[PDB]
Write an enzyme that holds these catalytic residues in place. Structure first.
Site, PDB file in Angstrom:
ATOM      1  CB  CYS A   2      -0.887   0.013   1.231  1.00 47.01           C
ATOM      2  SG  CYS A   2      -2.022  -1.388   1.232  1.00 47.01           S
TER       3      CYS A   2
HETATM    4 CL   LIG Z   1       2.180   6.237   1.469  1.00 43.10          CL
END
Ligand SMILES: [Cl-]
Length: 149
Positions: A87
């Protein structure tokens, strides 16, 4: 060829000519849409001496659409899922075609020492990072050692 494929060749040329410290990568033998990359953990951080392998997955919509990136090496970090999926805000809403493989990889190296506190993918790592830096570093040290295998 296609615009994505020409852009990927440009990204590779740029990365191989002037690689940032501790980062490299190249298209796979047989498919320019799938790259193998390596990130060395940043010096002075819990990840130092780690040699981490990654896979980058592109499409014909690159560079309009960001690739996905995953660690192949075992990882312990607030913003990395158990399956290795990374992520990174620039791979989501902050994406711009001004970023390329070089700057994606450098961002991931920097991510290692700068977790994003917002809704982390690995809650155990987030909680240790926040509340027990000492123990966070042991868990990171285990995956540093495994990265040499
Ligand atoms: Cl980030």
């Amino acid at each position: 060829s296609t615009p994505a494929r020409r852009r990927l060749m440009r990204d590779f040329k740029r990365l191989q000519e002037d690689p940032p410290v501790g980062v490299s990568g190249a298209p796979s033998e047989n498919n320019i849409m799938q790259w193998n990359a390596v990130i060395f953990g940043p010096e002075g951080t819990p990840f130092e001496d780690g040699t981490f392998k990654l896979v980058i997955e592109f499409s014909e919509e690159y560079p309009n659409k960001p690739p996905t990136v995953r660690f192949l090496s075992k990882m312990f970090h607030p913003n990395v899922y158990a399956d290795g999926s990374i992520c990174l805000d620039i791979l989501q809403n902050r994406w711009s075609p001004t970023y390329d493989v070089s700057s994606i990889l450098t961002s991931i190296q920097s991510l290692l020492d700068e977790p994003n506190p917002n809704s982390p993918a690995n809650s155990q790592a987030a909680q240790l990072y926040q509340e027990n830096k000492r123990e966070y570093e042991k868990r990171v040290s285990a995956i540093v050692e495994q990265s040499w295998n």
